[PDB]
Amino acid sequence: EIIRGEFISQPGGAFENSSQIIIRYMTTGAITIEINSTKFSKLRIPWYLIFRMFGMTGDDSIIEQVVFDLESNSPVNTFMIEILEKSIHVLDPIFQPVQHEPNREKIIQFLSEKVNAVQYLNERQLTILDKILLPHMGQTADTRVRKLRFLGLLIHKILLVIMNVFPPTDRDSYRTKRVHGSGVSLAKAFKAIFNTSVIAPII
Amino acid sequence: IANSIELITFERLILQWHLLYETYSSTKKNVMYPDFASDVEWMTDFLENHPLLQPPEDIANWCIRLELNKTTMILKSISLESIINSLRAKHPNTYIMHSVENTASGIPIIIRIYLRESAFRRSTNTRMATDEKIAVNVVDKLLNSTIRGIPGIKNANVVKLMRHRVDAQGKLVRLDNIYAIKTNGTNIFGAMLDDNIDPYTIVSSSIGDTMELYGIEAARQKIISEIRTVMGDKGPNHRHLLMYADLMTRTGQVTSLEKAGLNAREPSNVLLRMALSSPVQVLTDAAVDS
Amino acid sequence: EEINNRLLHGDIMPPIGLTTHDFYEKLQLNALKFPDRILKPIMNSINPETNGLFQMVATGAKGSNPNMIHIMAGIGQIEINTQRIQPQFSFGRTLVYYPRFALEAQAYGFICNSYIAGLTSPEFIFGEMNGRFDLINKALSTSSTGYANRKAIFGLQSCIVDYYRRVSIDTRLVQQLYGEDGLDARQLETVRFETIMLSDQELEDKFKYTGIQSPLFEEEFSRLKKDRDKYRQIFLNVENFN
Amino acid sequence: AMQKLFTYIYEFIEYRKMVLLEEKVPYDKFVQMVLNTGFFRINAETLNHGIVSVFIFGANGKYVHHGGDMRTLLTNTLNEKKHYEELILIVDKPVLSKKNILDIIVEQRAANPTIVINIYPYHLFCINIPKVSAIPKHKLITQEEAQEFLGREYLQPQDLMQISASDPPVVWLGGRPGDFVQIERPSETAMHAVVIRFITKSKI
Amino acid sequence: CKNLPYVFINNIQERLQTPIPVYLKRAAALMRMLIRIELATVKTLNIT
Amino acid sequence: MKICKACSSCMVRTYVDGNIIFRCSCGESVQGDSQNLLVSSKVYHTGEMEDKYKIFIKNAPFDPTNCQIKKDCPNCHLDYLTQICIGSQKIIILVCRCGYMSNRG
Amino acid sequence: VGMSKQLAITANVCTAGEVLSLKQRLLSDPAIQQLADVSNKDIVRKGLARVFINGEWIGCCTNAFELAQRYRMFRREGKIVHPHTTIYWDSMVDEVEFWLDVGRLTRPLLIVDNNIEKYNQACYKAAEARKKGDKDWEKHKIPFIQNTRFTSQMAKDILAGTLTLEDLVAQGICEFITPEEAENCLVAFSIIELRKHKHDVTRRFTHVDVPQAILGLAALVSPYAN
Ligand SMILES: [Zn+2]
Ligand SMILES: [Zn+2]
C-alpha cells in the first residue's frame, strides 16, 4: 500500500452504530474503498464502481466530483487527473468482469454474489449500501448525491496528501481525539450481551 | 578529487523530460507537438553541424526530449560533450541528437533521444508487453545512467584525518593536516579501479563488502572495528570483541548470531538450537535427520 | 535578533546541501549558546570554601557544571535530537502561546530563567518535553538491549576454554588462544611503552648502555629497536584499516 | 577494470612463482585481443613444470552468454597436449551468477578430475591482494608441519578454523582444499598472533 | 624472555626445553617486549 | 483526458504506428491529434508554493494566530503588516488584510 | 509503564450538544448555501468555503472567517450557540467546523479584547493628514490597547463565592476553548505577559490564561514546582 485514509462515520449520538469507511491507495495505482462493516466487510471495491452503483454513470462527472472541476489548469488539479485516470484502468483482480459494465444493475448484482428479481436484488443491496455508507449524511437514499460529493471530498483530501500538499494527520494531537466516559464503555458490551440475551430465546 | 568521485546520474542534470511518441525524418515532414514544434530550428541544424551522424532511420516512433540544468552543469563542472558521449557509448540501442550547443543563458540546452527498433523488438522475449511500457523502462534507464563518478557513492566530503608516520629522523609524529575523502556509500571495487585514491588503504564500514573483496580475516577485523565503534566511549575489553568476531567467522564465512547462524556453526547440537527458538521445527528436523 | 533580521531581508544564503530552513535553524542554534563566561558570575557569588553544592559538584561526588549553571545562571536553549522545538501544535505554531510564524527565540525552546529563579509556563513545558524525551529513550534502549542480549548469549554459549587454553565448541576451534593472549580480563592493568614514540637518536641516548664495550649490549639495544619497529609497523597498520 | 586487471594479472603470476611462456603484449594490443576474440589467454609454468592457463573473458562476449561456446573452448583447451595443472577463468561478477556457465564448469571438472578448474570475478586480480593493508599475511605450510602441529595439539583437520579456497589471499597463494594456511594477524590485546586454518572447497 | 612462552605450559617442559609453538611465542611477544623495556641494563643498574 | 461522445468514459491510450488512436469499451474509437503526442512529462522543481499555500496566503491577514511586523501597508498605510515565513526556502511574505502582498505578486 | 495521562486542573470533558438546533439555525440563516444550490465547480470558481457540523458537510459560505467570527460572537452572547460548542475555522483550507460532540476536553479561558477597530480608523485618518498639509497627523494616531475584562473586584467575589464561572461565562469575560478551537487562539501565558504587551500592536492576544492551569492536582501538590 501507499497510504490509508480511514473515516469512521457515526450518525447522531455515540450510542448509534458506526461505519469504518477505509479508502486505501494501492502501490499499483488502484483506489479501493473498504466498507469494513457487516456487509462488504472485506471487499476492496474500486472507487469508480462505488460511484456508478449509486447512479453516477458519466465518467467525466465521476472525475469531477473528486476534483470539483474539469477545466481549471491548476497544477494540483492537473496532476490529480493523471493519478485518477490511471485508477480507472487498474484491471483489479476481483470485480474484473464487472469492472467496465455500463449497466447500473449489473454492477450491483456482482457485489450481491460476493457478499424483476434483479430489481429486488438491487433494491436490497443499494438500500443496504445507503444504510452502510456515510450514515451521518443520512439514510433516506434520496441524498445519494450528497454522499457521493462527500466521498469525492475524501478522495481529494487523500490525494492532496499523496502529492505532499498537506502533511498526514497527526495521531498524538488531541484536536482529533475524544475522551469517553463510563456510559460509552458500558454501551459497548451492552449491545453484545443485551442482543445475545435477546437472540437466545428467539430460537 | 571528492567532487570527481561522487556519482552524478543523468537524472540529476535534467530539468524536465518528456515522452512524445514522435519520429524525426526529412521524409513526410512528421508533425511535432506544438510546444516543441519550435525545435525545428536546431533540429535540422544539428545534422548540418554533425553531418557524419544522421538518423539511422530505425526510429521506433518513441522519442525523449530533455532540457538540461545549466546551473548544475556549471556547478558540477561537466560539459555537454561528456554527457552525450557517455549517453551514446552506454546506450548504442538509441540515436542521440546533441541538439542545442552550449549557449549563453537564455537559450535552453535541449536533447532529443530517438529510440530504435532494437530495444522494442526484444519485448516479445519475456511477454507481449506493449511498446509503450518498455519505453518508460528505457527512459528510466536513461535517467539512471551514470555520467561520472564511482557508482554507489551518494556523497563524498573531504575530511581532516590524524595519522602517525615515522619521519626521516626515526620519530613517530602525529600529522593533523592529512586530508581524505569520506563517502556515503560503499564500493571498494570502484574505489580500487579509480586512480587518485590509494587502493591499498581503502577502508569501508561494510562487513559484507570487506568479506567479498578482501577475505575472511579482513571481515573479522572489520567486525571487531565495527562492534568497537558501536560500543562507544564505555566499551568492553578487546578480548570480548575478539570472541564475537572469532565465533562469527569460525567457518570461513561470516555467520549471524541468530537461528540461521547457529544452525551453521553447531548443526548437530539439536538441544541447544531447540532452546534458542522454534523447538518443534528443530525437533522435527532432528528426528527426520536422525 | 540580528540573525532574524538577516532572514527578514533575505540575506540568508545557505551553503550547498542545506536548505534555507536548515541553515537558519543551525545558525540560530549556534547563536543561542552560553558564552562559557556565564560561569564567572556564578563563581563570583559562591564561596568555594563553604559552598556545599559547589564542593559536591567539584569533588565529583555528585552533580556537574551544567547543573550549577541551570540552577543559578539560566537553563538556556532546549535541544531535542540536537534541534530546537519543531512546530507541532499547528502548521506554524510551536505552542498555543506564540504566533504562527514567530521569530523570537522564546518560541523555539529558549529558557532565559533559572531553576532557582522560577521558569514560566512555556519554559516549563519545554523542559518537560526534554525530560519525557530522555525517559522514553532510556526505556526503549533497555527494551531493545534485552533481546539481542539473549540472542548473543545463545550464540556464544558453547565457547569454553580448554586444557590448551584455546576456545572451542566441542573440540572445534574458535580461537587458538583466548583473546590471543590467554589472559583473564580482570588481571590486566594499563601500562605505557616508552620506546614507541621515541626518535632513533633519543632511543639510543636513553637505552644504549655504554658502560662495558661488549657486543652483548649492542645486541640488547638492537633487540629493543626491533621490538619498537615491530610495534610501530603492526599498530600503524591498524590505523590503515580503521 | 580491464586496465587494472592487465597490470595486476601478471603480478598474480609473479606472486605464485610461475614463469610466463609467452612474451608480454602492450595494453592496447591486449585489449584489442579481448574485443575481437572475447578472451585473452596467458600460459605459465609452475615450479613442478605444471601448466597453468589464465583466461580473461571480457563482458559482452559470446562465451559468457552461451554455454556451448564455453564448452568447446574448455574441451578443446583440455584436449591439448600440455600438462595442465589449473585453469583459471576470470569473468565479470554477474557471470558467476549465471547458472548455465557454472553448469559448463562443473561438468568439465568431472570429465578431468585430475585438472583443477576455477572461475573468479574481476576484482580478485584488479589489485595486488597480498599488499592490501587490511589483509593479514597468509602463508601455506607443508603437510608435515601441519601434521606436527596437529599431533602436538591432539587435533584433527576438521577441528581447525576453516578458510574457503576462494578466499582472495588463498587464491593468490594457490592453496587447494585439504591444505593448511598460516595467518599472522595483527592483534590489539597481544601485539602478534598466529592461527592455522583448514582450506575447504572453493565456493562455486 | 626466552622461556617466557612456557608460562602457557608447565614447568616440566621448561626444564626439558621442548619446542614451543609459534602461536604461544606470539602470545608472549608483548610481555617480552615490555620486560625488555622495563629491565634494560640502564634501568636496572642498581638491582642486585 | 478523452471521453467518447457516445459514453463518458476514459479513452485508453493505444497508439497506432501511423498515427495516434483512442478507444473505449464501447468502440467509436477516435484518432489522436498533434497535441496528444505527449504521453509522459515530468518537471524537476522543488515545492509547489504557487498554490500549495494559495488559500493560506489569502486568509493570513485575517488569522489572529499569525505573527505581525511594524512595517507599513503602502495601500492602507496601516502601521502593522502581517508576516509569514512560508516554505523550506524561508520566503518572507508580508501581507495586509487589504490584499497587498509584499515580496510576492 | 505510566501510559496513564492525568487531566489538567481546569480541564473538563464536555457533554454532547444539541446538533439539530444548531444545524437548523445554520441552514436557515443567510450566508450559507445548501449543497443543492451550489455545485462542485461553483465553489472552486467562487472560492466558497465549506461548512461542517459534527463532521457533516451541511453547506458552504462565501467567507469562512466572517461566519466563524459571527458565530463566536453569538456564542459569547449565549443567544443562539451553546457555550460549549467548538467553532473552529481552518485558514489553510477554507473550512468552518462546528463540533458538538461528546468527549471534547474543554478549559475556561479569559478573553482578551482590544480596540483595533478604533486603532485602524485613526490610522487611516492620520495617513490622510500626511497627504494634507496639517503636519499634525500624529495627533490622530492613538496607542493600541489590549486588556482583559477581569477585575480585581471580581477576583475577590469569587473567593467570597458570590461570583461563579457560569456567571463569568454568562458575561463576555470567559469562554471554553477545546484543543480543536485552540488552533485559532493566541494566548498570553500569564497576566504579566498580557500587561507587558498592553500597547503592543505587533502581538495581539485572543485569550489570557492562569499559568497554574497547565498542571493537575497531583502535580499542583508540589510547591514551587516550576
Ligand atoms: Zn465509450
Ligand atoms: Zn492594506
Q: What DSSP assignment string belongs to D79-106?
A: HSSS-EEEEEEEE-HHHHH-HHHHHHHH
Q: How far apart are CA G72 and CA G79, in angstroms?
A: 11
User: Which three three-digit cell numbers place residue A173?
Assistant: 494531537
User: Which three three-digit cell numbers place residue A105?
Assistant: 444493475
- Three-class SS string for chain C? CHHHHHHHHCCCCCCCCCCHHHHHHHHHHHHCCCCCCCHHHHHHHCCCCCCHHHHHHHCCCCCCHHHHHHHHHCCEECCECCECCCCCCCCCCCCCCCCCCCCCHHHHCEECCCCCCCCCHHHHHHHHHHHHHHHHHHHHHHHHHHHHHHHHHHHHCCCEECCCCCEEECCEEEECCHHHCCCCCCCCCCCCCCCCCCCHHHHHHHHCCCCCCCHHHHHHHHHHHHHHHHHHHHHHHHHHCC
Our separate counts of H helices and E strands in chain A read: 7, 4
Q: Which long-range contacts (CB under 8 A, 24 or more apart) does C123-128 make?
A: C123/C75, C124/G214, C124/G225, C124/G226, C125/C95, C125/G214, C126/C78, C126/C85, C127/C75, C127/C78
Q: Tell me the β-bridge partners of B17.
A: B66, F42
F67 CB neighbours in chain C (<8 A) are 99-103
Amino acid at B94: T
- Three-class SS string for F13-57? EEECCCCEEEECCCCCCEECCHHHHCCEEEECCCCCCCCCCHHHH
Our separate counts of H helices and E strands in chain G read: 9, 11
Q: Tell me the β-bridge partners of G53.
A: G56
Q: How far apart are CA E23 and CA D109, in angstroms?
A: 38
Q: Which long-range contacts (CB under 8 A, 24 or more apart) does B27-33 make?
A: B31/F34, B32/F34, B32/F37, B33/F34, B33/F35, B33/F37, B33/F38
Q: Tell me the β-bridge partners of F95.
A: F82, F101
What letter does residue A176 receive in the DSSP assignment? G
Strand pairing of F68-69 and F81-82? antiparallel
User: For G224, how many CA atoms within 13 A lie in the half-sphere containing its CB?
Assistant: 5
Give the residue numbers in C contacting G (CB under 8 Å), as ranges.
89-91, 93, 96-99, 118-122, 124-125
User: Which three three-digit cell numbers place residue A197?
Assistant: 440475551
User: Which three three-digit cell numbers place residue G150?
Assistant: 477581569
Contact G226 C119 (CB under 8 A): yes
Cβ-proximal residues to E16 (8 Å cutoff; 6+ apart), any chain: none
**What region does C81 belong to: left with phi over 0, alpha with psi -120 to 50, or beta?**
left
Q: How far apart are CA B115 and CA B23, in angstroms?
A: 9
Q: How far apart are CA G133 and CA C76, in angstroms?
A: 52
Contact B3, F33 (CB under 8 A): no
Q: Tell me the β-bridge partners of F14.
A: F21
Place of cell 483482480: A93
Contact G94 F59 (CB under 8 A): yes
Angle at B216 between CA B213 and CA B220, to 5 degrees: 110
Amino acid at B214: Y
End-to-end, the C-alpha distance of chain C in Å comes to: 44
Contact D185, D134 (CB under 8 A): no
End-to-end, the C-alpha distance of chain F in Å comes to: 32
Angle at B208 between CA D105 and CA B158, to 5 degrees: 125
> With the C-alpha atoms ordered D74, D78, D82, D88, is the resulting torsion angle positive or negative?
positive
Closest listed residue to residue B198, CA positions, set C241, C5, G138: C241
Q: How far apart are CA D19 and CA D45, in angstroms?
A: 5
Strands (E), B123-171: 146-148, 156-166
Alpha-carbon dihedral F93, F99, F100, F105, rounded to 10 degrees: 60
**What region does B232 belong to: left with phi over 0, alpha with psi -120 to 50, or beta?**
left
Q: Which long-range contacts (CB under 8 A, 24 or more apart) does B218-225 make?
A: B218/C241, B218/D132, B218/D134, B218/D135, B218/D136, B219/B249, B219/B254, B220/B245, B220/B246, B220/B248, B220/B249, B221/B245, B221/C241, B221/D134, B221/D185, B222/C241, B222/D134, B223/B248, B223/B249, B223/B254, B225/C241, B225/C242
Contact C100 F66 (CB under 8 A): yes
Q: Which long-range contacts (CB under 8 A, 24 or more apart) does C10-14 make?
A: C10/F92, C12/F90
Contact G192, G209 (CB under 8 A): no
Contact A159, A83 (CB under 8 A): yes
Contact F96, F82 (CB under 8 A): yes
Q: How far apart are CA G130 and CA G140, in angstroms?
A: 11
Contact D193, B246 (CB under 8 A): no
Cβ-proximal residues to B148 (8 Å cutoff; 6+ apart), any chain: B4, B7, B8, B76, B78, B82, B86
Cβ-proximal residues to D196 (8 Å cutoff; 6+ apart), any chain: C176, D141, D146, D149, D160, D161, D180, D181, D182, D183
Cβ-proximal residues to D153 (8 Å cutoff; 6+ apart), any chain: C164
Closest listed residue to residue D111, CA positions, set D156, D77, D78, D64: D78
d(CA F71, ligand 2 centre) in Å = 11
Strands (E), G162-206: 174-177, 187-188
Strand pairing of D51-57 and D84-91? parallel
Closest listed residue to residue C89, CA positions, set G186, B13, D181: G186
Cβ-proximal residues to G91 (8 Å cutoff; 6+ apart), any chain: F55, F56, F59, F60, F62, F63, G64, G65
Q: How far away is chain D from the Cα of E46, in angstroms, using its nearest Cα?
A: 30
Judged by DSSP in three states, B224 sits in: helix
What letter does residue D75 receive in the DSSP assignment? H
Amino acid at F17: D
Contact D114, D144 (CB under 8 A): no
Contact G205, G197 (CB under 8 A): yes
Q: How far apart are CA F47 and CA C168, in angstroms?
A: 60
Cα dist from A37 to A19, A40, A134, G172, whole Å: 6, 7, 12, 46
Q: Tell me the β-bridge partners of G177.
A: G107
Q: How far apart are CA G96 and CA G65, in angstroms?
A: 8
What letter does residue G6 receive in the DSSP assignment? P
Cα dist from C44 to A56, C40, C69, C75, whole Å: 81, 6, 13, 19
What letter does residue B79 receive in the DSSP assignment? -
Contact B166, B19 (CB under 8 A): no
Contact C27, C103 (CB under 8 A): no
Contact G35 A184 (CB under 8 A): no
Whole-number CA gyration radius for chain B: 28
Strand pairing of F85-86 and F91-92? antiparallel
Q: How far apart are CA F52 and CA G93, in angstroms?
A: 10
Place of cell 583466461: D55
Contact G95, G52 (CB under 8 A): yes
A69 touches chain F (CB under 8 A): no
Contact D178, D143 (CB under 8 A): no
What's this structure's resolution in Å?
2.9
F28 touches chain C (CB under 8 A): no
Q: How far apart are CA G50 and CA G71, in angstroms?
A: 15
User: What was the structure determination method?
Assistant: cryo-EM
Q: How far apart are CA C6 and CA C14, in angstroms?
A: 12
What letter does residue B6 receive in the DSSP assignment? S
Closest listed residue to residue B261, CA positions, set C157, D200, C168, C165: C157
Place of cell 536422525: B290
Strands (E), A35-101: 45-46
Q: How far apart are CA A52 and CA F25, in angstroms?
A: 16
**What region does D186 belong to: left with phi over 0, alpha with psi -120 to 50, or beta?**
beta
Closest listed residue to residue B217, CA positions, set A196, D71, D167: D167
Judged by DSSP in three states, B223 sits in: helix
Are D and C close enough to touch, i.e. 3+ CB pairs under 8 angstroms?
yes
Residues, CB within 5 angstroms of ligand 2 (ion): F 73, 75-76, 96, 98, 100
d(CA F21, ligand 1 centre) in Å = 14
Q: How many C-beta neighbours within 10 Å does residue D144 have? A: 8
Amino acid at G173: I
Which chains have 3+ CB pairs within 8 A of D?
A: B, C, E
Contact D158, D146 (CB under 8 A): no
User: For A128, how many CA atoms within 13 A lie in the half-sphere containing its CB?
Assistant: 16
Judged by DSSP in three states, G95 sits in: strand
Closest listed residue to residue G214, CA positions, set C126, A31, B182: C126
Contact B44, B182 (CB under 8 A): no
End-to-end, the C-alpha distance of chain E in Å comes to: 18
Q: How far apart are CA D185 and CA D191, in angstroms?
A: 9
Q: How far apart are CA A188 and CA A170, in angstroms?
A: 27
d(CA G45, ligand 2 centre) in Å = 24
Q: How far apart are CA B115 and CA B106, in angstroms?
A: 29
* DSSP 3-state percent helix, strand, coil across chain A (nearest 5): 50, 10, 40
Q: How far apart are CA F89 and CA C12, in angstroms?
A: 10
Whole-number CA gyration radius for chain D: 18
